[PDB]
Design a protein around this ligand. Structure first.
Ligand SMILES: Nc1ncnc2c1ncn2[C@@H]1O[C@H](CSCC[C@H](N)C(=O)O)[C@@H](O)[C@H]1O
Ligand SMILES: Nc1ncnc2c1ncn2[C@@H]1O[C@H](CSCC[C@H](N)C(=O)O)[C@@H](O)[C@H]1O
Ligand SMILES: [Cl-]
Ligand SMILES: [Cl-]
Lengths: 446, 450
């Protein structure tokens, strides 16, 4: 260790930045975020500085560097393109024992600016002393994905609870467990973020009433079409705190490889049975994640699985996912809309009735068929027997977003035979947008 | 942010600790190993202080607080159990603009001391600013079993190569591509952890020899509808490593806080073709450009128009899909887009009226579908009249979702004869959902009311 990390309180403390370019502007936005009383001294300023000044948010000293601007300063940052001026800044700062950063030169100054993950009042700082800015940014990117966006509001609210928790929990280890379920209750977190104070002390009273051991809830999490990188940040965070993950065939191996190490897995690849599995594994008092392919509310039966938790008292929440249409669209180079090609996008299945074929053949649509292969020969002639132009571009996307995605494409008179070249899970896309794939194909065809 | 973390260079710089017991000893060990010139001022001391002075590690001043001992100091720590003395020390340090910690009073004074995960020379610092010491500790634990122990040898080796890297690579973009490959090479990390120097050199020399691709790239990234948690892992990865982010008014501020702090940001908020060339000209300067778009880039996003010039131009590009507004607003309002058999199909429609076209209303009025109008607010009264006149029943439930997934989300709902009225009560950005699924809202609404 050759740097000591400290967390400085800068609110209304005099700080100085020397420089007025893009680099200084980024440091000024950091110091403004911390509430510093900011003076910025430069030969000239880019417009973002004069707008900041015209709003009373900092002070501008236009002109050469003047040492006396350090007279009552706590922090100094040299952010000019001129090594000579930066060296005069840092020398003037060192003889005044003002900690100083030189943006181009981390070893030439008395402090180094770390990568910051901001969950105020909780904060994480990562640095390797200027030996590795890229590693720092990589660790920041990781920490940013693991730390829920509203953890800071739980942190702030916990401090307003330290009393009421010791008064009802007289054991160290008992209180260690109350905080442990308190800080991962992200319903309470979102409840605080939304300023829905009826639902806060509702969740709060639940945290003191129910036993410590019981933290029961169900989260519907959309896994996306397969590529593990298409899981949402919130999805990952829920999967990392789950006591039990209920998943099915359509959730990819890559996503499951992200599940908590010490989490129980239930594989369910009849629909009524899945509903019961969710309920009383949540009535066991366990934090349950129901992982589903794509988006849980688009042909996922997510509606059916939650309504069982309704008259049952089990709290739930829903993390949306990248539906198959969106993923296959991006990864095949076929936009679902484009200029005037399509006034609407149609997400359609292929039980409970029969399809309206006149409707689907109407012009200016992008049609996206889910679960359609078993009717792909039927779809073909039924569309051209209801007016659809026989040359309509058509494409099929199998295992979209995955490392084994296959895209076969062509024209509506070939949909039947093209459909034999692909297996479930596949998507059928019909509309002029298909013809754009020749310009926008960037992913690998297998 | 209520604190600014900084990593201070304490070598040969004067620091003062007031107080002489166990809490002071723990802070003094931290400052000795940071390399500081340490003076300790206390009425009473414990053993390790008096050996350290005999061992020449520090200077002891036995007696009451002496504020003149701060005259040359850069940092001060008040670590007595007497809160009156601690306050004198912090008042004396403040008047000299010396950052000061009062150990038992995190909310007072001017810097707090974080808990540290040490990888030498990598370091992660974490604090809740005293507001919740328990959360800090649980987070330390997760970060620990997340940062591999030998990350420090990789970081230490990077620092030894930095002068070689700055010489052989002229531009900063090629230096970045070297580091990105460098920090993800698992064989290099394991060869370092073995002091296997022939293996470290074989891989290092191959890494320097790799002809670096010099083109830039354009990445369309779907921000999702607003909640920063609905950004994808890959979308976060692209903006955490971008050079320039070109972003909309419909990208939320929370997502903009996820953008690489050292990337610059071009705003384009309400020209479709100045955007196309801003991307092109900024890309093949050699830099990674992220075009960050609200929702999903290929659903009413004109993402196709932005990419179509690049292929014939020789510019690589990719697309990261996002959570389209229909999905986000469905999940966050408790209105599933499909359910059992309420809906055979979902229709995402542009409620905008291109100055020449008109929607096909008989088509949209059909039964057993969920209609979702994008940018349809200012024509909501026309949508009401047209759907009704083409056969949709008057009691069809509708909902308008404004700022869906944000903490400012509002949802108003009713039947189709209210749609025109209901739209007067929200502003953009808002979605219109028409269909039987809207009635499920009272059974599936988890997010809030507002
Ligand atoms: N990775 C993928 N590639 C292509 N189609 C997929 C897919 N994943 C799911 N699908 C489509 O979705 C159907 C399952 S229905 C479940 C859909 C899921 N809730 C979603 O939002 O995507 C499959 O028959 C297939 O047509
Ligand atoms: N957070 C939000 N809540 C409700 N509607 C939203 C929204 N964000 C975008 N929209 C809708 O989207 C329209 C812009 S069109 C761009 C949509 C984006 N490409 C996507 O896939 O979602 C707006 O007029 C509004 O109708
Ligand atoms: Cl670093
Ligand atoms: Cl478009």
């Amino acid at each position: 260790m050759d740097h000591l990390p400290i967390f400085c309180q800068l609110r209304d403390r005099d700080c100085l930045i020397v420089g007025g370019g893009d680099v200084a502007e980024r440091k000024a936005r950091l110091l403004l975020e911390a509430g510093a009383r900011l003076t910025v001294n430069a030969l000239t300023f880019i417009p973002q500085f004069t707008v900041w000044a015209n709003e009373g948010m900092l002070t501008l000293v236009e002109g050469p560097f003047d040492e006396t601007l350090l007279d009552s300063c706590w922090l100094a940052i040299a952010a000019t393109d001129d090594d000579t001026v930066n060296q005069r800044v840092s020398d003037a700062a060192e003889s005044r024992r003002i900690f100083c950063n030189v943006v181009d030169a981390p070893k030439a100054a008395s402090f180094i600016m770390p990568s910051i993950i901001d969950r105020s009042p909780l904060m994480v700082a990562v640095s390797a002393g200027g030996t590795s800015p890229v590693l720092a940014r990589l660790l920041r990117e990781k920490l940013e994905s693991l730390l829920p966006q509203h953890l800071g509001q739980v942190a702030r609210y916990a401090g307003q609870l330290r009393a009421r928790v010791k008064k009802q929990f007289a054991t160290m280890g008992e209180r260690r467990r109350f905080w442990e379920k308190f800080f991962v209750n992200d319903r309470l977190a979102q409840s605080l973020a939304n300023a829905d104070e009826k639902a806060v002390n509702a969740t709060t009273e639940r945290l003191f009433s129910e036993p410590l051991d019981h933290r029961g809830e169900v989260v519907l999490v959309g896994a996306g079409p397969g590529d593990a990188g298409l899981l949402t940040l919130k999805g990952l965070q829920q999967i990392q705190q789950a006591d039990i993950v209920v998943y099915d065939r359509l959730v990819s191996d890559d996503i499951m490889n992200l599940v908590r190490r010490d989490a129980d897995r239930v594989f369910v690849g009849p629909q009524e049975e899945i509903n019961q599995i969710l309920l009383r594994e949540a009535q066991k008092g366990k934090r349950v994640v129901r992982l589903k392919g794509g988006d849980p509310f688009i042909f996922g039966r997510g509606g059916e699985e939650l309504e069982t938790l309704c008259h049952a008292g089990i709290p739930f929440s829903v993390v949306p996912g990248i539906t198959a249409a969106s993923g296959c669209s991006a990864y095949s180079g076929i936009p679902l809309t484009h200029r005037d090609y399509a006034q609407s996008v149609r997400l359609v299945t292929g039980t409970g009735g029969e399809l309206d074929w006149e409707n689907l053949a109407a012009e200016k649509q992008t049609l996206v068929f889910y679960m359609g292969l078993n009717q792909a020969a039927t779809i073909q002639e039924k569309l051209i027997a209801f007016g659809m132009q026989a040359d309509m571009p058509v494409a099929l996307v199998e295992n979209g977003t995955s490392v084994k995605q296959r895209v076969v494409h062509g024209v509506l008179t070939q949909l039947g035979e093209l459909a034999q070249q692909v297996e479930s899970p596949a998507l059928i896309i019909v509309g002029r947008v298909v013809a754009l794939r020749d310009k926008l194909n960037w992913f690998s065809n297998h």
